Design an enzyme around this catalytic site. Structure first.
Site, PDB file in Angstrom:
ATOM      1  N   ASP A 146     -35.515 -26.902 -41.532  1.00 21.41           N
ATOM      2  CA  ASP A 146     -35.504 -28.209 -42.180  1.00 21.41           C
ATOM      3  C   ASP A 146     -34.131 -28.870 -42.076  1.00 21.41           C
ATOM      4  OD1 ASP A 146     -36.770 -29.450 -45.416  1.00 21.41           O
ATOM      5  OD2 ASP A 146     -36.207 -30.468 -43.558  1.00 21.41           O
TER       6      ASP A 146
ATOM      7  N   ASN B 229     -30.491 -32.584 -46.434  1.00 17.47           N
ATOM      8  CA  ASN B 229     -30.291 -31.167 -46.720  1.00 17.47           C
ATOM      9  C   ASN B 229     -28.866 -30.673 -46.466  1.00 17.47           C
ATOM     10  OD1 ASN B 229     -32.727 -30.097 -47.850  1.00 17.47           O
ATOM     11  ND2 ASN B 229     -33.730 -30.385 -45.863  1.00 17.47           N
TER      12      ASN B 229
END
Ligand SMILES: CN1CCN(c2ccc(NC(=O)c3ccc(C#N)o3)c(N3CCCCC3)c2)CC1
Length: 281
Positions: free
Chosen positions: A148, A153
């Site tokens: 991801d 993130n």
């Protein structure tokens, strides 16, 4: 069900920490499955000092969920630490619900930072890119796939230093248009072709995603493939070699990086160590 996706290709009680030395604070972010709050840990670490930290925890719905949080705890605890990963600092597995203590990154996530900055220098954008490539070089040396990789993130801590992690617990992916309801929730605009068609994930899959992340950084935070919908025509596009055009703020060699990351053959892409070196110039 809650679940992180760090995949390596049980619990050490040395991490344990008394929750009575844990003083909760403000909620930093809440998803439907749990939440992460900021706190103060008295006596956590060798220095026994006071450090501000972040505590991941589940809500009230249990118990194959509690299990997922544990599995995340174990993976983090095995990977070991690194200056550019959001590090495990301790945990509370007794006397109540599981708490996973991690590093607190005061400046929040990279994407938001970029967006309310549209002053940064191009040297800053270089520091972010490099730092993240170093955290990712570390993960893959541990045979760890992130799955991801994206600007949302990445976090920024003191000195605006980048740390990568997984923060799905603290946001609503079920109601997030960047994640597709294929069933699993998949960040398709960040996913390499083989992940989308062959469900294959590897370290080089991450490299592709790091390419898209580069694009986010040097476009100061635009959504990838602007104005292009996720659907059948889209899969045909990236499969056929379509690539996003150079961001306004990217130098020519940085855009070289992305183009290399977006090689259709996984083995043609650079490794994170190769990338790290070209970035130090
Ligand atoms: C002025 N503000 C902007 C940003 N902000 C902020 C600070 C920290 C974090 N997150 C973390 O430190 C952290 C470490 C591990 C995890 C997880 N999960 O989160 C954040 N966020 C909140 C939710 C998304 C992750 C980053 C914002 C607070 C106030």
């Amino acid at each position: 069900k809650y679940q992180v996706r760090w995949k390596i290709i049980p619990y050490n009680e040395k991490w344990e920490f008394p929750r009575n030395n844990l003083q909760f604070g403000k909620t930093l972010g809440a998803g439907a499955f749990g939440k992460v709050v900021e706190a103060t840990a008295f006596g956590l670490g060798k220095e026994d000092a006071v450090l501000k930290v972040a505590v991941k925890m589940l809500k009230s719905t249990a118990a194959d969920e509690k299990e997922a949080l544990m599995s995340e705890l174990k993976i983090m605890s095995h990977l070991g630490q690194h200056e550019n990963i959001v590090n495990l600092l301790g945990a509370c597995t007794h006397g109540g619900p599981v708490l996973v203590i991690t590093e607190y990154c005061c400046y929040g996530d990279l994407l938001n930072f970029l967006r309310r900055k549209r002053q940064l220098s191009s040297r800053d954008l270089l520091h972010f890119s490099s730092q993240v490539a170093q955290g990712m070089a570390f993960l893959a040396s541990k045979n760890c796939i992130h799955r991801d990789v994206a600007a949302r993130n990445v976090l920024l801590t003191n000195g605006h230093v980048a740390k990568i992690g997984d923060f799905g617990l603290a946001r609503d992916i079920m109601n997030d248009s960047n994640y597709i309801v294929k069933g699993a929730r998949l960040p398709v605009k960040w996913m390499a072709p083989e992940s989308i068609f062959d469900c294959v994930y590897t370290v080089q899959s991450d490299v592709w995603s790091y390419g898209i992340l580069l694009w986010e950084i040097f476009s100061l935070g635009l959504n990838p493939y602007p104005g292009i919908l996720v659907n059948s025509k889209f899969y045909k596009l990236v499969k056929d070699g379509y690539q996003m055009a150079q961001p306004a703020f990217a130098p020519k060699n940085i855009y070289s990086i992305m183009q290399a990351c977006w090689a259709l053959e996984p083995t043609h892409r650079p490794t994170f160590q190769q990338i790290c070196s070209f970035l130090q110039e």
